[PDB]
Scaffold this active site. Structure first.
Site, PDB file in Angstrom:
ATOM      1  N   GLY A  29       0.849  -1.196  -0.099  1.00 55.15           N
ATOM      2  CA  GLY A  29      -0.071  -0.042   0.112  1.00 55.15           C
ATOM      3  C   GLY A  29       0.739   1.497  -0.084  1.00 55.15           C
ATOM      4  O   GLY A  29       1.455   1.588   0.876  1.00 55.15           O
ATOM      5  N   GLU A  50       0.584  -1.214  -5.430  1.00 54.25           N
ATOM      6  CA  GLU A  50      -0.568  -0.520  -5.152  1.00 54.25           C
ATOM      7  C   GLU A  50      -1.776  -1.222  -5.938  1.00 54.25           C
ATOM      8  O   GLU A  50      -1.385  -1.488  -7.189  1.00 54.25           O
ATOM      9  CB  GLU A  50      -0.378   1.016  -5.553  1.00 54.25           C
ATOM     10  CG  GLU A  50      -1.854   1.630  -5.080  1.00 54.25           C
ATOM     11  CD  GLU A  50      -1.824   2.193  -3.657  1.00 54.25           C
ATOM     12  OE1 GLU A  50      -1.721   2.978  -3.130  1.00 54.25           O
ATOM     13  OE2 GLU A  50      -2.301   0.963  -3.008  1.00 54.25           O
ATOM     14  N   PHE A 154      -6.146   9.744  10.247  1.00 50.04           N
ATOM     15  CA  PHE A 154      -6.566   9.357   8.716  1.00 50.04           C
ATOM     16  C   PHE A 154      -7.461  10.378   8.353  1.00 50.04           C
ATOM     17  O   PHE A 154      -7.880  11.259   9.023  1.00 50.04           O
ATOM     18  CB  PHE A 154      -7.081   7.878   8.953  1.00 50.04           C
ATOM     19  CG  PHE A 154      -6.217   6.971   9.273  1.00 50.04           C
ATOM     20  CD1 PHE A 154      -5.085   6.104   8.744  1.00 50.04           C
ATOM     21  CD2 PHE A 154      -6.286   6.781  10.844  1.00 50.04           C
ATOM     22  CE1 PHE A 154      -4.524   5.346   9.306  1.00 50.04           C
ATOM     23  CE2 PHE A 154      -5.496   5.807  11.318  1.00 50.04           C
ATOM     24  CZ  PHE A 154      -4.444   4.875  10.653  1.00 50.04           C
TER      25      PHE A 154
END
Length: 235
Positions: A29, A50, A154
């Site tokens: 990721g 990814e 986040f």
RNA sequence: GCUGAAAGCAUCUAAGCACGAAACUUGCCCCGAGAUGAGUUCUCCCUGACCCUGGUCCUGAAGGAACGUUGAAGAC
């Protein structure tokens, strides 16, 4: 979703990230490139994997200033590694991948040092010794909780606090020889059927030999001693 | 682990012996011959007639069962 954007948060997270210059670092990721942008300078080589093509291109043009990396998309579920390469492997945050990436990092690789950001529930559950996947995990690697990650870090702020966990390998045991017995050991232990693995002489004297006081709270080393006693009793 | 060749060395074994795991079976206590493979021992009781060759009569043993007074036995 759930990407960390503030550079202060990135630096504070990297405070606990211990990567050295002579390490190749593999992945799970890239995100919006907030962290891999610093990662490409910290370490020697980066393998950016990814699943989003946009995200791959935005990482590419975000990292055009560097040549010490390469990008390669092989569904993490199928990707594979340099069985003959020493590599701290840094990765990202998944959905749940139920012992799917966990097997990729403990069972399908020789990863020496692993860092994850996970949900606080999985930080506390998978630590407890009441789950078998923990037992196959503790078979050859160890976990340490480095820090707890706040949820506002986040970008679609999640509902639950996160945590940073660290994996290091300490094997040498049921290697291949008593593995099928160690598996035979674990499922019968976690499912709690004692007679299949001990009579009553053994079930009682093993606990005192292992210093067991309550069956509802068990540590790892005395479970290891219990398995050693089982091997002694069953040749 | 001792001896020892097979296989001029050597070796717990191929001949033998000696050990040895909080492990197994007995050594402690209880149920248990419906164990249909239905076990063993000790003691007690029954020694009529007729026609017929299936019909009557006489005889009722040892013990058991029921009723009552009841239990430190018990839901019945």
């Amino acid at each position: 979703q759930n990407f960390i954007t503030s550079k202060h948060n990135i630096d504070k997270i990297m405070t606990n990230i211990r990567l050295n210059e002579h390490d190749n670092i593999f992945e799970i990721g890239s995100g919006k490139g907030h962290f891999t942008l610093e990662l490409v300078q910290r370490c020697n080589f980066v393998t950016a994997i990814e699943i989003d093509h946009k995200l791959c291109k935005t990482t590419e043009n975000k990292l055009v200033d560097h040549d010490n990396f390469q990008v390669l998309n092989k569904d993490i579920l199928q990707f594979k590694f340099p069985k003959n390469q020493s590599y701290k492997i840094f990765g990202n945050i998944p959905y749940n991948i139920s012992t799917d990436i966990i097997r990729k990092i403990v069972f399908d690789s020789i990863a020496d040092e692993i860092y994850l950001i996970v949900e606080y529930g999985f930080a506390k559950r998978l630590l407890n010794t009441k789950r078998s996947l923990a037992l196959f995990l503790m078979a050859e690697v160890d976990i340490s909780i480095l820090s707890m990650v706040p949820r506002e870090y986040f970008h679609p702020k999640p509902k639950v606090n996160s945590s940073l966990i660290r994996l290091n390998r300490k094997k040498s045991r049921i290697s291949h020889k008593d593995k099928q017995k160690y598996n035979y050991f674990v499922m019968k232990w976690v499912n709690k059927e004692y007679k299949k693995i001990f009579t009553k002489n053994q079930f009682n004297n093993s606990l005192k030999h292992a210093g067991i006081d309550d069956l509802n709270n068990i540590s790892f080393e005395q479970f290891l001693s219990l398995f050693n006693s089982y091997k002694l009793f069953n040749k």
